[PDB]
Write a protein that binds this ligand. Structure first.
Ligand SMILES: O=P(O)(O)CP(=O)(O)O[C@H]1[C@H](OP(=O)(O)O)[C@@H](OP(=O)(O)O)[C@@H](OP(=O)(O)O)[C@@H](OP(=O)(O)O)[C@@H]1OP(=O)(O)O
Length: 134
């Protein structure tokens, strides 16, 4: 079930899934609509679902990783799509091999240096590139 803020923006949660506490490498996933495009994993919050819980669930489903939830980075609007996304740091401790979106839609995942993640997100997802601005 899709959920919305009082202003009609769709509620979403995402994680910056880092390889380590050094936060030098981040996990991106392929778009289901355009498999040649990289995105930050995330998705819709369920009714009464805490944003930190939604963020962890969505990175499990989309990226097949689990780890240690860290700080809220911020709340980011995509005006064009009317999305409002809570973005958390996650330090990856488990990389699972046969995850929901691999099985179901062949979603891919790849580690990026932060500078390269910003580069590949800039064109289609400038708001996601801004998640890394700190
Ligand atoms: O959830 P996904 O697919 O794995 C990743 P996304 O949300 O970034 O994909 C969006 C895609 O974004 P992208 O593939 O760049 O991640 C964008 O692509 P755009 O046309 O370049 O804006 C649109 O796709 P289409 O071109 O197929 O309509 C969006 O369609 P909407 O009209 O908003 O429904 C897609 O939204 P979707 O419905 O798939 O969630």
């Amino acid at each position: 079930t899709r959920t919305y803020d009082g202003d009609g923006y769709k509620k979403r949660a995402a994680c910056l899934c880092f390889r380590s506490e050094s936060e030098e490498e981040v996990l991106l996933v392929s778009s289901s609509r355009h498999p040649d495009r990289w995105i930050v994993p995330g998705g819709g919050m369920e009714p009464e679902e805490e944003p930190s819980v939604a963020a962890v669930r969505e990175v499990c489903e989309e990226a097949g990783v689990k780890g240690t939830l860290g700080r809220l980075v911020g709340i980011f609007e995509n005006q064009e799509r009317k999305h409002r996304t809570y973005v958390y740091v996650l330090i990856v401790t488990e990389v699972l091999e046969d995850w929901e979106d691999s099985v179901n839609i062949g979603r891919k995942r790849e580690w990026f240096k932060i500078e390269d993640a910003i580069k590949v997100l800039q064109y289609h997802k400038p708001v996601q590139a801004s998640y890394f601005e700190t």
